[PDB]
Amino acid sequence: NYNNRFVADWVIERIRWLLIEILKASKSEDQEYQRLIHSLSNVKLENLEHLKRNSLDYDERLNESLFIGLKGDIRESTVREELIKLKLWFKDEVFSKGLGKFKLTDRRELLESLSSLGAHLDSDVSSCPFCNNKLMEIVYNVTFSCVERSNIEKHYLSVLSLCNKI
Amino acid sequence: SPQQICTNFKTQLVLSSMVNPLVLSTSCLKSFFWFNEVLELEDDSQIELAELTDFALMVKNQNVSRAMFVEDIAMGYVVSNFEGVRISLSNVMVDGVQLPPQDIGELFGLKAGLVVQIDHVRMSTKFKLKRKMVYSFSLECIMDVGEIQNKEVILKVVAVDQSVSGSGGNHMLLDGVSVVASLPLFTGQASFDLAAMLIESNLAGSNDNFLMRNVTLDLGGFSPELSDKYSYRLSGPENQEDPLVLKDGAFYVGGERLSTYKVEFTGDLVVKALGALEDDESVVSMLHQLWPYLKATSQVILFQQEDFTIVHDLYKKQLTKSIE
Amino acid sequence: LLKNLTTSSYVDEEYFMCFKYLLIQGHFDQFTNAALRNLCFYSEDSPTEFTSISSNSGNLKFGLSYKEQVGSNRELYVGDLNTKLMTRLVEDFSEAVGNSMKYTCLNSEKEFERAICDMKMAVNNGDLSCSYDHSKWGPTMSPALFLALLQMLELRTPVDRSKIDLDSVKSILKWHLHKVVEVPINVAEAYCIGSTSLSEEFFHQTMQLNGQIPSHIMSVLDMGQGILHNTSDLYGLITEQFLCYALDLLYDVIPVSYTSSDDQITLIKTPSDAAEWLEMICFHEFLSSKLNKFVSPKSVIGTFVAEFKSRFFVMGEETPLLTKFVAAALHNVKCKTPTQLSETIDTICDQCIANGVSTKIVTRISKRVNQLIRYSGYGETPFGAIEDQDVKDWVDGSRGYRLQRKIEAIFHDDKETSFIRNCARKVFNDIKRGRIFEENLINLIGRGGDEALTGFLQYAGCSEQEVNRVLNYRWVNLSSFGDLRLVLRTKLMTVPTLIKTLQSKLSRQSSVASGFIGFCKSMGSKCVRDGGFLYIKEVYSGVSACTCEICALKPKIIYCNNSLNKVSQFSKPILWDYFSLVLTNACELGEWVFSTVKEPQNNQNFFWAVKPKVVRQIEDQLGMNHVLQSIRRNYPVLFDEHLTPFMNDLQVSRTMDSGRLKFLDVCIALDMMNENLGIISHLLKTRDNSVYIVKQSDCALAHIRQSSYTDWELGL
Amino acid sequence: ETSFIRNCARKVFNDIKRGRIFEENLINLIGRGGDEALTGFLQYAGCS
Amino acid sequence: QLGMNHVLQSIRRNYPVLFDEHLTPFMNDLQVSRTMDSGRLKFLDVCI
Amino acid sequence: AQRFYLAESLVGFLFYQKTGERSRCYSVYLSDNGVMSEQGSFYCDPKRFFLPVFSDEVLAGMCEEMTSWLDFDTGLMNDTGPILRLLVLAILCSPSKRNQTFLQGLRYFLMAFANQIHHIDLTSKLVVECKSSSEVVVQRLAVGLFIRLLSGESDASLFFSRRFKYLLNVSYLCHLITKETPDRLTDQIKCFEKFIEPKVKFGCAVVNPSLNGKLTVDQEDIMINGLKKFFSKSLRDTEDVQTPGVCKELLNYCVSLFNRGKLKVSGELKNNPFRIPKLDELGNILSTYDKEKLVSACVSSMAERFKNLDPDSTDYLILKNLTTQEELSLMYEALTEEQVESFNEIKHDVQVALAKMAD
Ligand SMILES: [Mn+2]
Ligand SMILES: [Zn+2]
Ligand SMILES: [Zn+2]
């Protein structure tokens, strides 16, 4: 905001209004005048018709590479005929040859595939999780060593808390 | 038809009391829906017997329980065993002249510049106001009077203050405070027996100077009648006892039956109440205690028809066959 | 200061800072109005003339980042303010166009439910269900496709038939087509400082061969994930409609498709077993690949199970997804105060038990969160986290109801709480049936808990005996003179709760372990306030172990009055909170909670659905502009300050828009004083479940709490 | 006409005191003026 | 009874702008008229 | 060292040497009656074990219920119970993204197995490269469970709904392992890879533009070449079925079909729609702009104060604008390791600035 600590915060907007009125009354280019009035208002979406949209000899090739095949007025029956011909071509050129994208299950083959990809056979690891993972071995050791097998301490903990606090 | 309001409220109260014992406080009177007695601005007619507690609730009383037996008038026909005691002067100057008598002669000479200062009178009047019904009450009043000492004739008065205390009902303290303000005491002939007697008790002495110089008060006539409640007037050695309970439509002061007030239900009301209750044993207790209360009432208007077949939903043949 | 720093670093153990200071000390570092008028305050960068690639105020710069997911991280694009506003305008236009449409279900729960029931009916009947997930939806689409689409459309008006010109939309899309994506500086430094990688090869090839180190990347096909979502949704919708039309015309089947801008579900009804439809689906896949709709190998086609938005439907019922909700409950422990953690766990356990999980596992989660809040040093409180030993009555029951259940479970033979419930029922009858109570309870409650409770009691009816009896049970409230002060692990650079909830309603990377560690650490300093601040153990060390046969029914939870003579500032009655909770449940979900609980007199696999049996007496609609008027009436200074600076519709909230609601007057004052009721922020919300799958074994062991009429069927 | 208006006023009085469900909505209905307020009160009581 | 500090609260509730302007500049006892001193009278709401 | 109690006499000791939130190497010992024994050592990250901190009874109950789900055959749950529990245990003791990907692949496998038709490229999306020899055991356990539940010739589908529910809940065990980006730099690098790979494969990724709306001749040339390559797909060639692009013939067909009210949707819309961080660093707790603003404000306040001598209270200022020894400690404890490093950097900058001002 144009506020400051030298004026009573009521003359700045008056001076601004007087200045924009004097500017819009008489001038002296095209865009240097639209920014001066815009840079002194207070507050102000789509419909940007105030813009200019000047060409730069580059959008020509953009429109030439983007909107040559776009017509959007094709009839209804000719599309039916074209889809019929495309389906008849698809049936005997790429599907009867074996170049599809989907297939039946054959659940036995899926079971074999999962057993081949998941169950590792060429690995040197053993069939025991405890001796493979270190944390599992640790927890196993602790649990199998634990399952199968007085004012002094409280004074000590209190003084520990005191020194940790200080 | 506010008569129906009153009788339905009484029926609800008696049938709610005859499932378990409850205290006869505002907790068991205001906590009932049919207590529309606070409504119906024209309160000329009360339910059956609760005139006093209704008039108290119109003043928003905080009472709990007492012997509400106005049928035997507790405000009227009360013993009037009234008396008085000595005084104790404020602005203490008597402790220096009480013991040196061992006399009364120098004290009488001192009481004979002029040094008539203010006079402070302290009285503790204890009475034993009884009632018509079987009851008793002991009520004592403290009176502090700020007056002006006189030259020779009687006395001069400025102001008075009273403070009641002791164990006594609302009607008892009402009677006491009314008679202490309308007694042959100070207001009137004052019935004052000076005889240099209470001075001889305050000013310790066993001698007489043949001069009593009797005095009499001319009190203004203030009206300290602003309690009118069960409150023991801001002091008392006895508080919060004698609880009133209710088991079978009969007032139990401590376990003794006072009486049973008549309540009609006409059959439809009792089943309308039996409809929605807590559980089975509550209905059992209510229907077993109903006919014992019917013995103390007279109501055969209860229609013995299809409504009884509706009551038959609660198959409690033992309860209706136990009273026989 | 330099010598001081070197000496203080030398006296310590570390010598690296000493060497740095030693090095920086050793000095080892050695009259036209268009050109002279745009330097003082002239906004030269204001958009006045634009081109087909920019807007004279930048080139729609963006920033790349990742987002954490379970399987693999997702992309993320964050933009500047100008490009953010442009994307906002574009997405608003496209979402309006989509809301005008019907079949798409991305911001419409009605169409989502329609797709759900259609899929369920198809699975129950045996139609061809095909769940199509598409691979690389984001990094493959291009704004040029949307440009061509909008160029080819007409967008006819409803009543004008004017063929709206989509000129500005095409301009913004042409701007987006030439957006600049900036690479992270961390990857740049990692590839500059310095295993085979194609992108690393491209970085080293574009490091200094053709130009400088790559920092800005523009291309044709980006379509940043989370930028053009609505336009991509509409394009996918129209393409799938064209595809289903083509399939209907070619293979004489009945297809219906539902889309979500990333995946689709197609329900195909065939005439006149399913081994003669491979050509149809492969032709459909080929036609989709002819467009920019490449299908992922994870897409499935069958007639036994259907999937949509991770919601699997099979013949007869639906999968409960137990472990997902269990892991969601065990995770996301975000705690700022124990109350908000309790509420979050409440919502999570509710939405978990909604999908027929169990009644014995939720108790364990509640015990877990109780132990978590206890380990932090806060100690157990009467409310605390979710109660233990619950039942299947999460239905027709809110947070207030389970809090009341916990407080009732505290007492074995309820005689005080039953009396409080009777007093609350009396107040409810005299305020509704007698109907003479308003704004006086507001004057009586604003004081606090002690005098308010005895005032309500003497309004119902009592003596000094009840005053000294009921008001004896006390519990320690550490947040009595305010809230617990604490600074947790937040991001850098930075009054009752009802005001904050209302402000949130009107207006519009951190780990859980570190968060909880900071929580437990900050709960050990001077936190509790008074008058000054002090410790929690300092307050809990002042209680006297009287043990007078009344403060031993639940240790560290309920005390007596004389046991807190040393510290009496933090001592509030629990029966007052019980009264408030009972009255709040009455204003919320009916009067069936005034009766007494009675107990009643299956293979663990008989599941079935149940519906809530609530009955509201609080003007069921209960929209906005009703709490605002009540606050303006009851709390004028609290309505002026901290409320309604950001509002321009005060006229309707002031001109008595259905003023003096039946209970919103009194059912709102208990919420602002008590810090843990939270009912006004709950009344303005939907059930979010509307149905609960439960097993029969839990329905037969529930408590039967249905109240008879308080008038004992005696009224009329 | 005045007897009918008195009957409507008695109905409003009963429903605001005995029925006891009326407040601050009559304030919103009266502030407009005399015409619409009267027909609003009438259709609240009952009319055509 | 119907004393003061009852019409003032009703005006503050029903007519806030009319209670701020033209009313209570010459008053120092707004706290009692604001803290619901027997608020919502039986008829002073609509009879005013 | 940290301590944990296990029994009446024996306790467990956890020894380490580093601090912060990084991954460390720990050593666990026991102590029965003073004789300190050796239990072992390991190397892990502490911020990836928050789930089982107190969930020792919830997991037991959930696995017990999941196993009792299969009570239709007395003899099948007895073999899957311990296997399920061991699998869950191995999952908790080894948090990794590869396990989550493997379980998601198993979910997709089950989904494709339940139905009748599936894609031809399915089995290539389920394999994941396992390292550290720790994923082998969990993958073997999951595969063995899936086989034990799915294998069979005739009597293998007596109750298929229960089997499907059990297998789905087993595959959904990936939500147990948390998702907290095991490494930030590697994740950012991989994100940049996945972002810029398709554009380099296509051949349209230009180099640093002018950032003003002015492209050189080569930039616009390659842009137009990419635009042409995007719309240069025919309706008969089966070679371009995995590369981006669209054919104009099918687009014109769909457009002309939608315009003339033939699809289920049309252009009959109502309610006419015409009614400071840096971008080069996302994830950093503090950008260079904020550091610079803070140090400038602090040095300006310190210069305004000198109107010399300055205690460590200036450091207090750093704690005041970013988030009296007690308040200093309370405001300093709430920082993380990277946060405390950045705070030390800012402190060093402010102190060297004040020192150079002193000269
Ligand atoms: Mn999907
Ligand atoms: Zn082993
Ligand atoms: Zn105790």
mmCIF file of N, CA, C and O in Angstrom, chain C residues 14 30 38-39 41 67 100 108 143 145 151 234 268 274 290 348 356 393 423 509 520 564 591 611 684 706:
data_model
loop_
_atom_site.group_PDB
_atom_site.id
_atom_site.type_symbol
_atom_site.label_atom_id
_atom_site.label_comp_id
_atom_site.label_asym_id
_atom_site.label_seq_id
_atom_site.Cartn_x
_atom_site.Cartn_y
_atom_site.Cartn_z
ATOM 1 N N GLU C 14 36.180 -29.997 19.773
ATOM 2 C CA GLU C 14 36.168 -29.892 18.321
ATOM 3 C C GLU C 14 37.174 -28.851 17.843
ATOM 4 O O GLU C 14 37.268 -27.751 18.398
ATOM 5 N N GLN C 30 40.823 -13.241 -0.117
ATOM 6 C CA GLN C 30 41.037 -12.247 -1.163
ATOM 7 C C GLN C 30 41.755 -12.841 -2.372
ATOM 8 O O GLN C 30 42.165 -12.117 -3.279
ATOM 9 N N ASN C 38 10.469 3.725 -15.698
ATOM 10 C CA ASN C 38 10.109 2.393 -15.226
ATOM 11 C C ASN C 38 11.055 1.888 -14.141
ATOM 12 O O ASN C 38 11.327 0.685 -14.068
ATOM 13 N N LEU C 39 11.562 2.783 -13.291
ATOM 14 C CA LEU C 39 12.529 2.413 -12.268
ATOM 15 C C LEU C 39 12.129 2.812 -10.856
ATOM 16 O O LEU C 39 12.751 2.329 -9.904
ATOM 17 N N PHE C 41 8.457 3.318 -9.345
ATOM 18 C CA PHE C 41 7.369 2.457 -8.899
ATOM 19 C C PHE C 41 6.544 1.906 -10.057
ATOM 20 O O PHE C 41 5.460 1.360 -9.817
ATOM 21 N N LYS C 67 6.186 -37.124 -4.201
ATOM 22 C CA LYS C 67 5.213 -37.341 -3.143
ATOM 23 C C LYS C 67 5.268 -38.799 -2.722
ATOM 24 O O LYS C 67 5.402 -39.695 -3.563
ATOM 25 N N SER C 100 -21.374 -30.247 -15.609
ATOM 26 C CA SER C 100 -22.473 -30.288 -16.566
ATOM 27 C C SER C 100 -22.659 -31.686 -17.140
ATOM 28 O O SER C 100 -23.756 -32.027 -17.596
ATOM 29 N N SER C 108 -18.099 -35.936 -7.699
ATOM 30 C CA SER C 108 -19.536 -36.160 -7.552
ATOM 31 C C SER C 108 -19.725 -37.516 -6.889
ATOM 32 O O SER C 108 -19.512 -38.554 -7.524
ATOM 33 N N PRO C 143 -0.631 -30.796 -23.745
ATOM 34 C CA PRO C 143 -1.655 -29.749 -23.891
ATOM 35 C C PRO C 143 -2.125 -29.547 -25.320
ATOM 36 O O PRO C 143 -3.212 -28.992 -25.524
ATOM 37 N N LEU C 145 -3.121 -31.842 -27.361
ATOM 38 C CA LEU C 145 -4.304 -32.674 -27.550
ATOM 39 C C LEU C 145 -5.556 -31.967 -27.049
ATOM 40 O O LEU C 145 -6.584 -31.939 -27.738
ATOM 41 N N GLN C 151 -10.598 -26.897 -29.844
ATOM 42 C CA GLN C 151 -10.796 -26.290 -31.155
ATOM 43 C C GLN C 151 -11.896 -26.999 -31.933
ATOM 44 O O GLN C 151 -12.658 -26.354 -32.663
ATOM 45 N N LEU C 234 -12.182 -34.972 -18.550
ATOM 46 C CA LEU C 234 -13.227 -34.781 -19.553
ATOM 47 C C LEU C 234 -12.821 -35.407 -20.883
ATOM 48 O O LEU C 234 -13.646 -36.017 -21.576
ATOM 49 N N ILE C 268 -20.143 -54.714 -19.261
ATOM 50 C CA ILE C 268 -20.640 -55.112 -20.570
ATOM 51 C C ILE C 268 -21.675 -56.208 -20.375
ATOM 52 O O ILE C 268 -21.382 -57.256 -19.780
ATOM 53 N N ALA C 274 -17.341 -67.359 -21.812
ATOM 54 C CA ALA C 274 -16.736 -66.059 -22.076
ATOM 55 C C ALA C 274 -15.398 -66.180 -22.798
ATOM 56 O O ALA C 274 -14.514 -65.337 -22.613
ATOM 57 N N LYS C 290 -4.529 -46.397 -30.097
ATOM 58 C CA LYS C 290 -4.528 -45.419 -31.179
ATOM 59 C C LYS C 290 -4.686 -44.003 -30.641
ATOM 60 O O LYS C 290 -4.195 -43.047 -31.252
ATOM 61 N N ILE C 348 -10.748 -42.903 13.340
ATOM 62 C CA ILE C 348 -10.133 -44.007 12.613
ATOM 63 C C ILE C 348 -10.736 -45.338 13.044
ATOM 64 O O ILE C 348 -11.064 -46.186 12.208
ATOM 65 N N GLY C 356 -16.777 -54.078 9.339
ATOM 66 C CA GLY C 356 -16.802 -55.370 10.005
ATOM 67 C C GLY C 356 -15.467 -55.991 10.363
ATOM 68 O O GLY C 356 -15.170 -57.108 9.928
ATOM 69 N N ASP C 393 -21.960 -50.866 19.762
ATOM 70 C CA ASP C 393 -22.795 -49.673 19.719
ATOM 71 C C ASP C 393 -22.034 -48.440 19.252
ATOM 72 O O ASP C 393 -22.398 -47.317 19.623
ATOM 73 N N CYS C 423 -31.528 -35.659 37.037
ATOM 74 C CA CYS C 423 -31.575 -34.199 37.055
ATOM 75 C C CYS C 423 -31.524 -33.629 35.641
ATOM 76 O O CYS C 423 -32.221 -32.656 35.327
ATOM 77 N N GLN C 509 6.082 -34.427 5.241
ATOM 78 C CA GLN C 509 7.518 -34.652 5.121
ATOM 79 C C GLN C 509 8.124 -35.033 6.468
ATOM 80 O O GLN C 509 9.210 -35.610 6.530
ATOM 81 N N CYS C 520 7.091 -36.343 23.531
ATOM 82 C CA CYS C 520 7.496 -36.837 24.841
ATOM 83 C C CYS C 520 8.573 -35.960 25.465
ATOM 84 O O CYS C 520 8.634 -35.834 26.694
ATOM 85 N N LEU C 564 -6.753 -32.919 47.736
ATOM 86 C CA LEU C 564 -6.148 -31.908 46.877
ATOM 87 C C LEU C 564 -6.072 -30.556 47.578
ATOM 88 O O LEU C 564 -6.187 -29.510 46.940
ATOM 89 N N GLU C 591 -33.498 -38.757 23.568
ATOM 90 C CA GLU C 591 -33.590 -38.942 25.009
ATOM 91 C C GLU C 591 -33.532 -40.409 25.427
ATOM 92 O O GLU C 591 -33.878 -40.734 26.566
ATOM 93 N N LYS C 611 -28.185 -50.146 10.178
ATOM 94 C CA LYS C 611 -28.373 -48.718 10.019
ATOM 95 C C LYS C 611 -28.530 -48.049 11.382
ATOM 96 O O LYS C 611 -29.088 -48.643 12.310
ATOM 97 N N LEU C 684 -22.477 -29.958 12.290
ATOM 98 C CA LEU C 684 -22.338 -29.501 10.909
ATOM 99 C C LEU C 684 -21.488 -30.469 10.092
ATOM 100 O O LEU C 684 -20.511 -30.086 9.449
ATOM 101 N N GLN C 706 -32.678 -48.815 25.805
ATOM 102 C CA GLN C 706 -33.766 -48.094 25.157
ATOM 103 C C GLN C 706 -34.670 -47.546 26.248
ATOM 104 O O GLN C 706 -35.132 -48.298 27.114
#
